From Swiss-Prot, chains A, B:
Listed cofactors: Ca(2+)
General function of this protein: Involved in calcium binding and uptake in yeast phase. Required for growth in limiting calcium conditions and for yeast survival in host macrophages. Is able to bind a variety of lipids.
Organism: Ajellomyces capsulatus (strain G186AR / H82 / ATCC MYA-2454 / RMSCC 2432)
Main location: secreted
Descriptive protein name: Calcium-binding protein
Cofactor mode of binding and number, as noted: Binds 1 Ca(2+) ion per monomer.
Keyword Signal on entry: yes
Length: 78, 78
């Protein structure tokens, strides 16, 4: 439960930075998938409309790539 | 502090989805910036290497766009 958007990140960061490199630092990064977010997903945008960017869409667009948590390209960076 | 990457998201989502649409639902979304993440930032990738994708890089690549928190394109979607 984040109090704000910018403040959310502060909390977010500590939480994510540790979570994703946890998988990479552990052994490897997908690298290909993250490009995918920075590529474009019909979700991250459809997200704009569905709540903080409908996580299933945006952070999922991101998780499916850089936010990192793509069970499809992982086996490395989750 | 997230226990895992996938589990992180569960927590994340509730936290973000509320934070970003908080700004949009409030009045408007940048829309242009979010495309920016789904576009490509030298950060989100440089992030892959600097911790869960160095928030200042990835979620900042995302915040500077879809994760949402771009004080540059905001005035709407933070």
């Amino acid at each position: 439960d984040q109090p704000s958007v910018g403040d959310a990140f502060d909390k977010y960061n500590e939480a994510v930075r540790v979570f994703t490199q946890l998988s990479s630092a552990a052994n490897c990064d997908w690298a290909a998938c993250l490009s995918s977010l920075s590529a474009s997903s019909a979700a991250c945008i459809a997200a704009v409309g569905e709540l903080g960017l409908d996580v299933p869409l945006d952070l999922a667009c991101a998780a499916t790539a850089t936010s990192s948590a793509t069970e499809a390209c992982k086996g490395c960076l989750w």
